[PDB]
Amino acid sequence: NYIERVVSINRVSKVVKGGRRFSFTALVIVGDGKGMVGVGYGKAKEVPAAIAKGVEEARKNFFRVPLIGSTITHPVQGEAAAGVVMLRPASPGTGVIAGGAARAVLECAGVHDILAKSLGSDNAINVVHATVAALKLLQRPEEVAARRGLPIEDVAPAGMLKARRESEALAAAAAREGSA
RNA sequence: UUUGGAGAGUUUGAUCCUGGCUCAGGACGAACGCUGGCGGCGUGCUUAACACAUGCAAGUCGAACGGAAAGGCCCUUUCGGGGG
Numbered sequence: 075n076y077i078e079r080v081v082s083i084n085r086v087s088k089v090v091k092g093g094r095r096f097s098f099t100a101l102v103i104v105g106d107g108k109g110m111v112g113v114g115y116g117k118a119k120e121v122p123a124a125i126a127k128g129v130e131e132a133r134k135n136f137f138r139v140p141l142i143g144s145t146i147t148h149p150v151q152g153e154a155a156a157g158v159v160m161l162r163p164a165s166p167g168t169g170v171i172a173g174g175a176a177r178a179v180l181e182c183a184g185v186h187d188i189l190a191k192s193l194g195s196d197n198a199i200n201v202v203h204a205t206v207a208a209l210k211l212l213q214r215p216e217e218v219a220a221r222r223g224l225p226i227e228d229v230a231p232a233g234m235l236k237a238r239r240e241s242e243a244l245a246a247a248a249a250r251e252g253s254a
Numbered sequence: 255u256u257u258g259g260a261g262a263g264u265u266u267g268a269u270c271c272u273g274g275c276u277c278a279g280g281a282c283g284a285a286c287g288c289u290g291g292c293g294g295c296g297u298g299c300u301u302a303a304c305a306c307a308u309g310c311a312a313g314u315c316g317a318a319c320g321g322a323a324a325g326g327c328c329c330u331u332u333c334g335g336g337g338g
C-alpha cells in the first residue's frame with residue numbers, strides 16, 4: 075500500500091533554429107504513512123512517462139522519519155538552499171496544519187498532529203527540499219542517549235517517556251489484535 | 255507546571271532570489287439599492303462648543319412670626335356682606 079501525490083506540473087520549452095520544442099516535468103511525493111517518505115522528480119515528453127519516472131525515483135529514494143507516536147520530538151529549524159521551514163510538536167488531536175507542499179509531505183509521512191510554517195521560497199520544490207532537510211536534522215532520543223552514554227531517564231523528560239510508554243502499549247495492543 | 259502559528263495569484267522562451275500589488279476571516283455608534291411576517295433584547299447628532307419658537311427640568315415648613323386674599327365650621331345677615 076503505497077500512497078502518492080502530485081504537487082505541480084510545469085511546461086518547459088526548448089528553442090532551436092527550426093522553432094520551439096516542448097517537454098513536460100513534474101515532482102511526486104510517495105510515502106507509506108508509517109514513517110517512510112521519498113521525493114521523486116522526473117522529466118519526460120508526456121505526462122505518463124513523467125509520472126512513471128517520478129514514481130520510480132521515489133521508489134529508488136527512501137528515508138525513515140523517527141517520529142514518536144503521533145508528533146515530532148523537538149523543535150527543528152531546517153534551512154536548505156533558499157528555503158526555510160520550521161517544525162514544532164503539537165498536543166494530541168490538534169491536527170495537521172501547514173501549507174500545501176508541507177501538508178502533502180507530512181501526510182505522506184503519516185503523522186497526525188504537528189505545527190509548520192513557511193517563511194520564504196514559496197516554490198514547491200525548494201519548500202519540499204527544506205522540509206526533507208529538516209526531517210534529516212531531526213534526531214532520535216534513544217540514539218542521542220546512546221551517544222551521550224548516560225541512562226535514558228536522565229536525558230529524557232517524564233512527559234516524553236510516559237508518552238513513549240503509552241505509544242508502546244498501544245502498538246502492542248494493536249499487534250495482538252491483528253495477530254488474533 | 256499549562257495554552258497555542260496554514261495559503262493562493264501575479265515579471266520570463268523556461269529557472270531561482272529580493273521585493274511590490276490583490277484575494278480567501280472578524281468587527282461597526284454605519285450609509286446605500288432591493289426586498290420585507292411575527293416575538294423577545296440592547297442601542298439612536300461621530301460634522302456646526304452653529305442659532306434657537308415653544309412647554310417643563312427646585313422647592314418645603316402655621317409644631318417660628320405678623321396675619322386672613324381665597325376655602326371649611328360656628329355666631330349673623332339685606333345674600334353686600336360683619337366677628338372667632
Ligand SMILES: [Mg+2]
Nearest residue numbers: 153155156158
Ligand atoms: Mg538565510
Ligand SMILES: [Mg+2]
Nearest residue numbers: 196197263264
Ligand atoms: Mg508570491
Ligand SMILES: [Mg+2]
Nearest residue numbers: 165168257258
Ligand atoms: Mg489557545
Ligand SMILES: [Mg+2]
Nearest residue numbers: 263264265266
Ligand atoms: Mg507572466
Ligand SMILES: [Mg+2]
Nearest residue numbers: 264265266267
Ligand atoms: Mg506572459
Ligand SMILES: [Mg+2]
Nearest residue numbers: 194271272273
Ligand atoms: Mg529582502
Ligand SMILES: [Mg+2]
Nearest residue numbers: 194195272273
Ligand atoms: Mg517575498
Ligand SMILES: [Mg+2]
Nearest residue numbers: 287288289290
Ligand atoms: Mg423595504
Ligand SMILES: [Mg+2]
Nearest residue numbers: 292293294295
Ligand atoms: Mg413566549
Ligand SMILES: [Mg+2]
Nearest residue numbers: 295296297298
Ligand atoms: Mg432598538
Ligand SMILES: [Mg+2]
Nearest residue numbers: 306307308309
Ligand atoms: Mg424658551
Ligand SMILES: [Mg+2]
Nearest residue numbers: 312313314315
Ligand atoms: Mg423652602
